[PDB]
Design a protein around this ligand. Structure first.
Ligand code: NA
Length: 129
């Protein structure tokens, strides 16, 4: 599924991401835009042979099982394919564990490089939330 900007902002808000670990909703929408262009089916291979899955490009190195990332963990206890669903529940629940891990949203290099410090409120501008 390719979410609309406000559609994804509403779904993240309903799933309790708004101000989760102190990150305002625009931070999450901005991260999703640059990680996946709001496409749940986005996948990208990392240099290390891990893969990133879904709207928030969650990595098989630590967070999900894809059966092809040697010596990896599955800390969200899900198959990585669950992260490609039209229903963002699994992505959001796993994102909450990642952002609680100690480095906040710096875990998402595209958030650090492209969202951090920017006017992230612009990402929820005009949305009926
Ligand atoms: Na894994």
């Amino acid at each position: 599924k390719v979410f609309g900007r406000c559609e994804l902002a509403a779904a993240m808000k309903r799933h309790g991401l708004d101000n989760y670990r102190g990150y305002s909703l625009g931070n999450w929408v901005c991260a999703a835009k640059f990680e996946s262009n709001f496409n749940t089916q986005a996948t990208n291979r990392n240099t290390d042979g891990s893969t990133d899955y879904g709207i928030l490009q969650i990595n098989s190195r630590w967070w999900c099982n894809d059966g092809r990332t040697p010596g990896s963990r599955n800390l969200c206890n899900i198959p990585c394919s669950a992260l490609l669903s039209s229903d963002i529940t699994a992505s959001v629940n796993c994102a909450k564990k990642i952002v609680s891990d100690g480095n906040g949203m710096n875990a998402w290099v595209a958030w650090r490089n492209r969202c951090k410090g920017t006017d992230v409120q612009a990402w929820i501008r005009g949305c009926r939330l």
